[PDB]
Design a protein around this ligand. Sequence first.
Ligand SMILES: *[C@@H]1O[C@H](CO)[C@@H](O)[C@H](O)[C@H]1NC(C)=O
Lengths: 216, 213, 137
Amino acid sequence: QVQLQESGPGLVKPSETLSLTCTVSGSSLTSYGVHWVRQPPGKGLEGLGVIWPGGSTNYNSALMSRVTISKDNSKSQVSLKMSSLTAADTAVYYCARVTGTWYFDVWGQGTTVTVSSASTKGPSVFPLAPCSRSTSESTAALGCLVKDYFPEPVTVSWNSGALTSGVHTFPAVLQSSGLYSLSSVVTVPSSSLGTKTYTCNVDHKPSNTKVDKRVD
Amino acid sequence: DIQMTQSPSSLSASLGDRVTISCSASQGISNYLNWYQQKPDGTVKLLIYYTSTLHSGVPSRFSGSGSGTDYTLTISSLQPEDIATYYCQQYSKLPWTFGGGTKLEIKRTVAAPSVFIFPPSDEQLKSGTASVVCLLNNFYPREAKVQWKVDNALQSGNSQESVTEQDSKDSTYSLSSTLTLSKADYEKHKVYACEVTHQGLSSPVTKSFNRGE
Amino acid sequence: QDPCSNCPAGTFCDNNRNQICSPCPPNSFSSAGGQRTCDICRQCKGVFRTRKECSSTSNAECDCTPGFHCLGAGCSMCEQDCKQGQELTKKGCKDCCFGTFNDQKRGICRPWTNCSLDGKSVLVNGTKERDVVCGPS
Ligand SMILES: *[C@@H]1O[C@H](CO)[C@@H](O)[C@H](O)[C@H]1NC(C)=O
């Protein structure tokens, strides 16, 4: 089926070559165009360039010709290269499928890129369980604290994805150390907490880090 | 480039209301405008292309109209899952430019938060730092006051808040306040509490725990 | 069996229409059949000039605007011309030094052919535009 997925490094230092990859599932690149869009933090969508089925490209002038887009039809991959990166190039980058004349009918989930000289650090995961089990409260709150990571993209899932009801994952905050941290919590029926196990699944791709912490 | 402007930048409407967001171009674009919806988690999908043509699978309550330099996107009956940012996009001239987007939030009846507190994990104590977390769950409106007190002494400058976006079902927010102290400072005191003040709370509700239990 | 296979170069396929194959809109093309979008014709502006106009089935190609010449593969960039007997330096077009020449509206000056070192005599003296013409004995 038709799907687009961006991929690439999340941390790039100001030695400034960025390289991303857009993989297309159910759409031949000889029949569709592919457009790259980026969204800086707290900003709107900004297109970068498009590569057409024939292979020709068009680029935004504001990118000062630092952006180059290529593709390999046999590999179903579209490549994005950007040089002379500033911190202004920190954003989440989307690739979309150009169909008809013209519209973006299929969008990828986006990939986050951070431009900084700081080193990448994996996070620590700590359980968030109440001081004691309360019989009066019919609902108890569980969670896990993901602390001291960089760069920002961190994903959290509960019971390997099986538990989604009542799952709230909070946006990250920037600590005074410059390291990010976020909390993810879930509300559960308190009568059932002693039987089933609850584990939060934390993935931090910039540090090749995966951690599965059980929460009693 | 062609300039795309969307009015208003932010909008709050009740459920079942008729929503209308505007999009104006600096020059005529001859009905070459698309509408996109960005969910709070980042997902972007196409709603309408050529200013009135509904993309396959989009609910029939979405509709677009306009000509020349002025176009609109219409939601006939606002639904809870419509909480998102909406962008218009012109393809009259390269490079294709997006509008600034209109952030849509949903009004609803008052909902009181459910408060919880979490003692610093023993594993975290071994590291050298202590973080105590206060959770405000599924409340409305967004305005909520969290005050940390350690042995009845009101804290300040040592906590950070974080708020979820509006929930796709309840139209509610959730908030996490994290109080960070060093390990030595954490063991000096006994009672840790967070006091929550909210419109749906007749009087502030405090949740507390005693260290060592 | 693929209905888009019937749409040749110059058209694009979209199954949401009564007519599956539709002509590529003006200023757009498709160099192969079965496309479901049309490539937009590329621009030749600034220092560039449209050499070959784009059609419904082929892209436009750019040469350089008059006063400039192509440089790099496929006329990737353009470089300013100079008059014969000149040379494009970092300080603009400058006349060649005495003893050098440039017979083209591009490139650098080159020293005159030393007829004596090759065992020949000078038939025609050198010029900023022309090399020395040597002759036998
Ligand atoms: C021009 O060439 C002739 C012979 O070809 C030579 O005798 C004469 O000196 C040259 N002109 C100058 C200014 O030297």
